[PDB]
Amino acid sequence: MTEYKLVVVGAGGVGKSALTIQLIQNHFVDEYDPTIEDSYRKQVVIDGETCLLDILDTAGQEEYSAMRDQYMRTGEGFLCVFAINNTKSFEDIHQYVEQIKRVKDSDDVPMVLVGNKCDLAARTVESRQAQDLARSYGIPYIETSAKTRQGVEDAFYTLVREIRQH
Numbered sequence: 001m002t003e004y005k006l007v008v009v010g011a012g013g014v015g016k017s018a019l020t021i022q023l024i025q026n027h028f029v030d031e032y033d034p035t036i037e038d039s040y041r042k043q044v045v046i047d048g049e050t051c052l053l054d055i056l057d058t059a060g061q062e063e064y065s066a067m068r069d070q071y072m073r074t075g076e077g078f079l080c081v082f083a084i085n086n087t088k089s090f091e092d093i094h095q096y097v098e099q100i101k102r103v104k105d106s107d108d109v110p111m112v113l114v115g116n117k118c119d120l121a122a123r124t125v126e127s128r129q130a131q132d133l134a135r136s137y138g139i140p141y142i143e144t145s146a147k148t149r150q151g152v153e154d155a156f157y158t159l160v161r162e163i164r165q166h
């Protein structure tokens with residue numbers, strides 16, 4: 001069966017682990033344990049096709065930035081996550097995308113931009129601001145809440161589907 005190698009990236013605390021754990025294990029992680037680098041795998045049917053999701057949950061803490069090249073070499077598609085209540089995390093998205101593009105030596109890398117924590121009302125990144133950034137990349141923008149599950153499957157499955165247009 002087809003295996004898809006997904007990598008979840010973004011600034012510390014934007015909800016990468018919570019997003020991944022909600023997809024794979026169907027519960028919300030309320031506590032904040034910073035990640036170094038974890039792996040998850042799951043068999044899912046997407047558009048009538050059985051496939052294996054291999055998901056790498058990466059470190060947002062800048063301390064582990066040296067590990068980025070290795071996983072950007074391996075990953076097939078990148079979920080680029082910021083939190084809609086954390087403008088700096090939105091501003092940090094580009095540093096992840098620029099490096100993925102260098103490492104891949106390509107402008108056409110399967111990616112989805114994700115504005116997470118859309119359940120929270122303290123919004124400082126407006127959806128239109130993120131839409132404009134996604135448009136410049138030529139990639140989808142999808143808002144999510146790892147807490148309520150809104151958009152969680154859509155974001156990951158859209159990323160699968162971008163690796164398939166590729």
Ligand SMILES: Nc1nc2c(ncn2[C@@H]2O[C@H](COP(=O)(O)OP(=O)(O)NP(=O)(O)O)[C@@H](O)[C@H]2O)c(=O)[nH]1
Binds near residue numbers: 120145146
């Ligand atoms: N309300 C709300 N809280 C969320 C959401 N996603 C994550 N959080 C909360 O935000 C905190 C950080 O979550 P986490 O998933 O660990 O972020 P991270 O991006 O994995 N951090 P790191 O880069 O250090 O591994 C946790 O307390 C988590 O419960 C969301 O969609 N909504």
Ligand SMILES: [Ca+2]
Binds near residue numbers: 027029
């Ligand atoms: Ca919980």
Ligand SMILES: [Mg+2]
Binds near residue numbers: 018034035057058060
């Ligand atoms: Mg984490």
Ligand SMILES: [Mg+2]
Binds near residue numbers: 124
């Ligand atoms: Mg503003």
